[PDB]
């Protein structure tokens, strides 16, 4: 099965109207380190909820 007519740039754009990405709503701030991080995830420097959980 294949198209009988070439779909338009308009229709292509309409299909892609749901493709937009969503930015992370907000980042959390660790209470000790002050580092931004994804909520419920450890920081880049290995903190979570103010505790040095992971060294380096």
């Amino acid at each position: 099965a294949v198209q009988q007519n070439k779909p338009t740039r308009s229709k292509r754009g309409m299909r892609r109207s749901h493709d937009a990405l969503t930015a992370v709503t907000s980042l959390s701030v660790d209470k000790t380190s002050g580092e931004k991080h994804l909520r419920h995830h450890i920081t880049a420097d290995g903190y979570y909820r103010g505790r040095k959980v992971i060294a380096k």
Partner: protein, 118 residues
């Protein structure tokens, strides 16, 4: 439908899953913290925590059951001599999962799983 069913298939067959969790349980007991995918970490709790519970009561029978389930006498010794004693007064919850972002190669959600008194 999967109503009320437990256990993740993890895109493996039963023999592969069993072997993988035996290996990963060994790794967590040895190192006390490992990094793995978040779903594997959640499944690993159901394998590792019963081994620690078993290890609270040191007997020949329990060491052999632990050996049947781990196949590593270094792991069995650590379970019975170190971890069982360390967790003697703790009613479950011997591990904690800490989410740690996404793997570079495949964007897999990752977590650390560690023993709680590490």
């Amino acid at each position: 439908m999967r109503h009320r069913k437990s256990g993740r298939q993890l895109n493996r067959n039963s023999s592969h899953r069993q072997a993988m969790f035996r290996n990963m349980a060994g790794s967590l007991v040895r190192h006390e913290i490992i990094k793995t995918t978040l779903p594997k970490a959640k499944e690993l709790r159901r394998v590792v925590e019963p081994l620690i519970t078993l290890a609270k009561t040191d007997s020949v029978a329990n060491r052999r059951l632990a050996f049947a389930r781990t196949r590593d006498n270094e792991i069995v010794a650590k379970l019975f001599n170190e971890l069982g004693p360390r967790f003697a007064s703790r009613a479950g919850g011997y591990t904690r999962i800490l989410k740690c972002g996404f793997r570079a190669g495949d964007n897999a959600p990752m977590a650390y799983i560690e023993l709680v008194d590490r």
